[PDB]
């Protein structure tokens, strides 16, 4: 788990709310859409989760 | 939040710092009760004896 | 945090602060300021800077005007100290004063 | 009166309250407020009520501004009550602040 609670959480919160991907929709539109649905400005922490461990998660992994 | 930013005083007093002389107030407000108290007691007191 | 333990110092005077007094002083002052220590000492040492925690700090408008209250107001008035400290002193990460 | 003792509390943040620190409030503020109280206690037994002393009373600009001083700033703050208890209390008669 990740907390968001001080300056340097809201810092972090930030930088997981800026990470986007843009996916192009059936009608060829770009939709931006952010990695972290989960966090927003209310969110006061996360997880991340890995069942096999989270060095076989591809995000820690490389 | 804004303790993370900040630190807060909430007065949470109803005002109390405004009345001057609170311990004279409330010594005076202590009596008035007692005396009304006692006058109607002395009173039944002395209906019944 | 809700530090709200307290002893009643009803009927001390200045002519009458004695070892109950002291007792009292150390638990709503001394000793409150030392938890506070105590918990940033375990959030410092596992690295939880991300956590500061809230402090409801339970102070009083009573600085004499009561009286009679022995050091009781002392001791309320030793803790508004605090809010200078959490700017002076290297523990805001940890904690924050309400 | 001129009870200008006091003891150095340099270097002391927040984490390092120590014995020290105790002895250096119990001397600036606690036993202060005794010396004060002994005194009252002779002249109220002795009926000297047309000597009140003055208590030249060493309070500080320093309310945590310097910062790593332990509770020298706590001690003096807490000495600021005095001017509050001379009205509330009933030793007037036989001290003064100053």
């Given at each position: 788990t990740i907390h968001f609670g001080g300056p340097l959480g809201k810092k972090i919160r930030a930088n997981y709310m800026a990470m986007t991907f843009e996916t192009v929709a059936a009608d060829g539109s770009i939709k931006s859409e952010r990695i972290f649905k989960d966090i927003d400005e209310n969110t006061t922490?996360?997880?991340?989760?890995?069942?096999?461990?989270?060095?076989?998660?591809?995000?820690?992994?490389q | 939040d804004l303790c993370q930013n900040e630190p807060v005083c909430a007065d949470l007093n109803?005002?109390?710092?405004?009345?001057?002389?609170?311990?004279?107030?409330?010594?005076?407000e202590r009596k008035n009760?007692?005396?009304?108290?006692?006058?109607?007691?002395?009173?039944?007191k002395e209906t019944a004896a | 945090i809700v530090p709200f333990a307290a002893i009643s110092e009803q009927?001390?005077?200045?002519?009458?602060?004695?070892?109950?007094?002291?007792?009292?002083?150390?638990?709503?002052?001394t000793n409150l300021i030392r938890l506070?220590?105590?918990?940033?000492?375990?959030?410092?040492?596992?690295?939880?800077?991300?956590?500061?925690?809230?402090?409801?700090?339970?102070?009083?408008?009573?600085?004499?005007?009561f009286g009679s209250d022995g050091?009781?107001?002392?001791?309320?008035?030793?803790?508004?100290?605090?809010?200078?400290?959490w700017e002076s002193e290297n523990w805001s990460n940890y904690l924050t004063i309400c």
């Open positions: 922490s996360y997880t991340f989760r890995s069942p096999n461990g989270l060095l076989s998660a591809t995000q820690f992994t | 109803g005002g109390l710092q405004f009345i001057p002389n609170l311990n004279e107030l409330m010594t005076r009760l007692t005396e009304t108290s006692e006058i109607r007691q002395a009173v039944t | 009927g001390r005077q200045i002519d009458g602060i004695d070892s109950k007094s002291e007792l009292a002083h150390r638990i709503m002052l506070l220590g105590a918990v940033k000492t375990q959030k410092a040492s596992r690295g939880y800077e991300t956590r500061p925690a809230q402090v409801i700090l339970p102070l009083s408008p009573n600085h004499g005007t050091l009781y107001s002392e001791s309320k008035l030793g803790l508004e100290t605090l809010f200078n400290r």
